[PDB]
Homo-oligomer: A and B are copies of this chain.
Amino acid sequence: NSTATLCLGHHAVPNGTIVKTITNDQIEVTNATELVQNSSIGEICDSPHQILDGENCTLIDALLGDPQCDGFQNKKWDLFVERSKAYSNCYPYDVPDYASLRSLVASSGTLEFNNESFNWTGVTQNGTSSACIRRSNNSFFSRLNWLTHLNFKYPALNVTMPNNEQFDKLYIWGVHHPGTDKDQIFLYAQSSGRITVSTKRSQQAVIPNIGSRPRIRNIPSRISIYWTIVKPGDILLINSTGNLIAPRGYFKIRSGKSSIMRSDAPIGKCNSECITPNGSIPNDKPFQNVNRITYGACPRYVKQSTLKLATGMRNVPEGIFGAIAGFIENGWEGMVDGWYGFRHQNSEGRGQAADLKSTQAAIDQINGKLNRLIGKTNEKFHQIEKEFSEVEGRIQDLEKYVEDTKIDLWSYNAELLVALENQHTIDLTDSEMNKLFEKTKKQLRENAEDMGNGCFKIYHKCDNACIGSIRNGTYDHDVYRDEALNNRFQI
C-alpha cells in the first residue's frame, strides 16, 4: 500500500473468428474479413456496361437477319447475352468454325451494316422461302441475297467490290445445298454449281453438295455460311456458276472491349461492374467462387469457398514476441475503447485506460494490408469459352487445361496470401503489445519491478495523477527514486 501496481494488457472479444496461418490451421482472432465473394443477386445489371439481351436470337441469327431478329439491326454492345431458349426460325444453316465467327463478331461489338450495290446482271435476285416468313410473307435472311436463274439461264458471274475505305469490311455469304438434282435445276438451271470468292490475300473455294439431310422444320436442304475480311486497298472477287447466297453489303468490324456471354439471368435496372452468368457480383473482394466466366472489373476465380483475412490480434479470453497469449495471460473483454491499455491499482482505487498510439499503430498496419487487397480488381473482357455443349477433342482439351491451370495457380496464391498475412498480423499485434510494455518499463527506471505477467510493481506512492503521468509520458522518475530505492532494497 506504500506501493502501486500497473498492468499492461490488450483487449479480447466474446465472439472470435477462426483463421488459418502458416503454422496453425485453426487460430482465433478478434475479427476477420471475407476475401472470397460467394454470392450473386441473381440479375445482370444493365449498367455501366451496354447490355444486349439476345432474347430469342443468337448473335449469328441477328447477324444473318432472321426476321425474328430484325430489331437488332445495327446495334452495338459491350456484352451480348445469349439465352438458352433461343432458336432459329429461318432457312436451316450451318457455319464451319461457327465458334470463330461468333467470337470475332462478339469481340467487334457491332452489327453496323452498309449496303453495297453489286452488279448481278443475268440472274434473279431476292430469292425467298416458306421456312423464313417475315411479316406473314415468305422471305429470307435480311443481309443475304438468294440468287436464282433468270429466264432459265445462269451465266458465270465475275463480280468485284473494292475496299476504297479507311476501315476493314466484313462480308458474310453462303452456299446452298439443295436436297435434289431436281431443285438444283429448278433454281440454278445448271446441274453442278460452284462458288469461288477471293481477295488479293485469300481464296475460298466451295463446291456445293446435293443430297438429303434430316429435316429441320421440314427442310432437308442446307446453307453453309462463310466469311471474308477485306482491308483498305484490297478487293473482293466473287465467281459463281450457281448456288451462291450473295451478301447485300459488309459489316463494319471494330476492336475494343466487347464480348458475349451465355446466361439465363434476367437483366436488372441496377449498376454493377462485374458480370457472371449467375448474375452481377460485387467486386470489393479480391477473389470469388461464383463463376470462372466473368466480364468486367471482377474478383479472380478461386476454388476455395471461403478465405478469412485476420483484421485483429489473437483472441485470448478468460506470437514471436511472447506477449499476447504469452506472458500476458489473457485479454480484457472490458476494454472497448482501445486494443492495448493500462490497468492500475493504487491508494485511490482500481482503473483501466486505453493507449491510443499503440492501438492506432496496429490498426494502421492492418488497414495497409486491406488497402492492398480491397477494391483493386482487374478488368477482363473477351476471353475464351469455358463451358462446352459438344465433344470436340484436342482444341477443347487445350482450352480446358489452360483454364484449370490458371485457376489452381490463383487458388494457390490466395491460400498462401492469407496464411502469410495472418501469421504476420498476429505477429505485428503481439509486437505492438511488447513495444508498449518495453517503453513503460524504461519509463519507470529503478522505481518499479517486472512481475513477469505484464504487471509492474511500483515501489512508491502513485496516485491517479502519477499513474496518468506514466500513461502520457510525463512521469519524472527522479521525483520518486529515493522513495522507491529505499522500498526496493530493504530487509
Contact = CB atoms under 8 A, between A and B. Distances in A.
Interface of A: 21-25, 94, 97, 99-101, 103-104, 158, 160, 177, 196, 198-203, 205, 209, 211-214, 216, 222, 229, 234-235, 237, 239, 253, 320-322, 326-327, 364-366, 368-369, 371-372, 378, 382-384, 390-395, 397-399, 401-402, 405-406, 408-410, 412-413, 416-417, 419-421, 423-424, 427-428, 431, 434-435, 438-439, 442-443, 445-446, 449-452, 482, 485, 488-489, 491
Contacts of A321: 320, 431
Contacts of A439: 322, 327, 452
A137 B134 CA distance: 62
Contact of A214 (B234, B408, B427): B234
Contacts of A419: 372
Given A229-B390, A237-B212, A394-B100, A408 B378 contact: yes
A443 B452 contact: yes
A103 B409 CA distance: 25
Contact of A369 (B22, B97, B410): B22
A154 B216 CA distance: 29
Nearest to A481: B491
Given A372-B419, A393-B100, A320 B431 contact: yes
A108 B439 CA distance: 69
A201 B99 CA distance: 14
Contacts of A450: 442
A214 B196 CA distance: 12
Contacts of A392: 100, 104
A327 B485 CA distance: 26
Nearest to A177: B203
A340 B106 CA distance: 63
A460 to B, nearest CB: 14
Contacts of A405: 402, 406
Given A22-B368, A22-B421, A368-B25, A393 B104 contact: yes
Q: Which 6 A-B pairs have the closest CB atoms?
A: A100-B393, A442-B452, A23-B368, A322-B435, A23-B365, A198-B213
Contacts of A406: 405, 409
A56 to B, nearest CB: 19
A443 B320 CA distance: 20
A488 to B, nearest CB: 8
A258 to B, nearest CB: 13
B397 A398 contact: no
Contacts of A202: 94
B211 A23 contact: no
A214 B239 CA distance: 11
Given A320-B428, A326-B435, A384-B398, A393 B103 contact: yes
A372 B491 contact: no
A431 B322 contact: yes
A383 B397 contact: yes
23 contacts: A21-B368, A22-B369, A22-B424, A23-B369, A25-B368, A94-B201, A94-B202, A97-B393, A99-B394, A104-B393, A158-B212, A199-B213, A200-B216, A203-B222, A205-B211, A253-B391, A320-B321, A327-B439, A384-B398, A405-B406, A409-B410, A423-B424, A443-B452
B378 A22 contact: no
A6 to B, nearest CB: 15
A402 B398 contact: yes
A237 B253 contact: no
A360 B198 CA distance: 73
Among A177, A320, A420, A424: residue with most chain B CB under 10 A: A320
A392 B211 CA distance: 31
A406 B402 CA distance: 9
A275 B215 CA distance: 48
Contact of A391 (B104, B239, B423): B104
A462 to B, nearest CB: 18
Contacts of A25: 368, 371-372
A181 to B, nearest CB: 11
A384 B368 contact: no
Given A103-B394, A372-B419, A445-B449, A214 B229 contact: no
A336 to B, nearest CB: 25
Contacts of A158: 212
A387 to B, nearest CB: 13
B401 A398 contact: no
Contacts of A177: 203
